[PDB]
Design a protein around this nucleic acid. Sequence first.
DNA 1: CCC
DNA 2: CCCC
RNA 3: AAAA
Lengths: 411, 428
Amino acid sequence: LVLIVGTNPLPNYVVGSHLKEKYDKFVLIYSEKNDKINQNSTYDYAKKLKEHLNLNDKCIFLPLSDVSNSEKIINDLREKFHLNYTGGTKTMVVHIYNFLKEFEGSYLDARDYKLVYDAISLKDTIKIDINTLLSIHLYEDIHFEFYDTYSYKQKFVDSFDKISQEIEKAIKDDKGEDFVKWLEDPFRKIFKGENKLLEKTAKFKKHIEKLLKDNDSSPIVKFNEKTPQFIWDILNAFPEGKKLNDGQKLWIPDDKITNDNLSSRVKDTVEFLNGKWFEWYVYSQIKSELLDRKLKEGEHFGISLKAQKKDSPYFALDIFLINGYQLIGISLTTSSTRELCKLKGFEVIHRVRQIGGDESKAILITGMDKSKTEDLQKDLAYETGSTQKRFVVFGIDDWADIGSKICEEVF
Amino acid sequence: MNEKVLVLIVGTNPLPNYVVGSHLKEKYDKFVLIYSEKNDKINQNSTYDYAKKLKEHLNLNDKCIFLPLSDVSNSEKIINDLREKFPSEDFVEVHLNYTGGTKTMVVHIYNFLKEKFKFEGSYLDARDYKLVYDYSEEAISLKDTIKIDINTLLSIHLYEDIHFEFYDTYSYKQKFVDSFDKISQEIEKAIKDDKGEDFVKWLEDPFRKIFKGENKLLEKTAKFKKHIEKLDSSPIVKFNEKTPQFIWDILNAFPEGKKLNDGQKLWIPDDKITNDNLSSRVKDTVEFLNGKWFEWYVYSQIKSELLDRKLKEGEHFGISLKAQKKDSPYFALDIFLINGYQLIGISLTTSSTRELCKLKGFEVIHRVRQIGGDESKAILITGMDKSKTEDLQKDLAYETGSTQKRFVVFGIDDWADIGSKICEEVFK
DNA sequence: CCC
DNA sequence: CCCC
RNA sequence: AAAA
Ligand SMILES: [Mn+2]
Ligand SMILES: [Mn+2]
Ligand SMILES: [Mn+2]
């Protein structure tokens, strides 16, 4: 079994995991680093493949000084040496399929998830976890949260379930559109102003005063009088020390309220209601189904995934999901705005590519109507050669049944 | 008679086939474009739209033969489709450039045209811009030979309704006639004097606290008055007392009818100021100072160095590019630049916030890949410091097999010499 | 890294 | 139209 | 894994 090590390590891991039991020795062709010819090395991917495929003594590393020149290829192939030709450049594939012949040949079809011999579907045969997937793509310090280790369960203890159930009831009663509009106005008009607004008692008090310069038109009036009943019930499901409501009105802090007391009461509550809630909602709707499909939490799905390349910044991904050996990254936002949603679309498309390879699927769930979501999908669509979409946008109309929506899209 | 044929494999990246065709059309008489056919059962999309664009922008006419393949991943079906559809006419030289298509297509097409036949196989190197012949052992550099314009580049990637702006037709030269040159020169002086950081921080506070907030703030006298009422911590005093001198100069470079200052102080409308009077004075000035100016500044610091390299404006560079796929939303790119056959898209922002600049980074990465192919380069110019600039480059870096970066970020410390920095990054 |  |  |  011979493999060509390009910049996408996942196809070689899938083929290697399958065609290791039937083989003895393993050769991996990798490129060298020549900054002059703008050629980087895939040796790091070749090492990850050996480690994650357990090939300590059977593995042979063959370096090619130039993967774009047949002359320098064969010269390097001469001095040192079932071919799966799925990876590497076109030259590497030609001048190795022929050099070695001068003999079975395989190829992993990224479109139908089948290894083809010069057949066998591997979509429900070869499996991978989140740690192995990000490791072969060179990411480390992987951490995520479980259903029972969710961060906000520790912040609103003894009240989270009531809070989450109340929000879940509203969304399943098709109130998600009403919730978003109230979040835009007046919620974000009171609790989203300047930086450190909810951390300095004076900053918040000044903001509240200036808001009372419009009287009945002031957003605090919309909060007090024109707030729907299901939103009050959500607000009142929070602990009294973490409530944004003073009984049935907007809480105005006296100057005696310390900065840590204001922050300890408002900050966690505002950030959750301004969007983090939607992360938990979707994840809870998904976990109620994926377990029936034998997926294991922490191995094949989870929430708040974070990792980094070596000495490099961390990324944040709301939800990850592995179906067979395809990564499905899900980005979540309550925004109904085209600018932000588009940018969020660019982000999730690039992230799943970085951590799961070029055949990963990105899903963006927004608070936009059906027309805006179709426009965004077309705007960000990129041609990969497949009929199935690798970027999918959902909208406010999908929130109530988002669990089955994602199940149909992923599986 | 002695008919010589060139064979190209139509993958999802049309640019390499256009470059190979533009360089080899003169040497061959027939051209066979092997493309894929759509079959949803095997999740196989078709690349025929690219092969059709290749015939159009290469002017192949009837000397073009379209050879469809049913399954780009099945060795047997490819071999059968090739035998029943490759031209059996006796040729003298058969040249296959196997740069595109799937790995399976490349394997068997190369062998099929190896047994049937003079023969020569070629491959275009995306890393060092070199066409490698498999038997001539020549490696011709096409980086300075084959050229492409913005219209043909976006067209072969299936985009249309392309429009952009020129140096002389720039939008704000139409809005600030006579005064634009004075406004632009004063700003360029301060930036080339390393006053970029000061300007940015002054734009964040107190400029954006005064002229940015509610919608239609600067077009409604009542909304602007209430805003000023709400504002010794107010940004108005920071404007009237703390505003630096080079900013007073660029503010005074505006016409007195379009100036935000009322004479070393903030102009506050009286109660006889119409809504239209307010917007006519400050709207264009605020929007130009909040960021539009930076687009013109960067474009002006590069136009000279681009013309010196014999690039033609409108075809190889331009400002405010816009295009769309058929019946699809439009994109907007601040600056575009084509070096040989490589697109360089430049997104510009004066923001120093890490989150907004990160999102702007994802944007320019995706757009240049959509309109220019997978070997395009994206540049993001920000008002961030070098440490955050370098952090963003590593955060968004994607490995494709090159040593040179395909996503570059520049920061506030590059503004004074941004022309040379772009020149060295693009041309090397 | 919510918006 | 997408300046921040 | 359809200019690695
Ligand atoms: Mn494991
Ligand atoms: Mn999110
Ligand atoms: Mn811009």
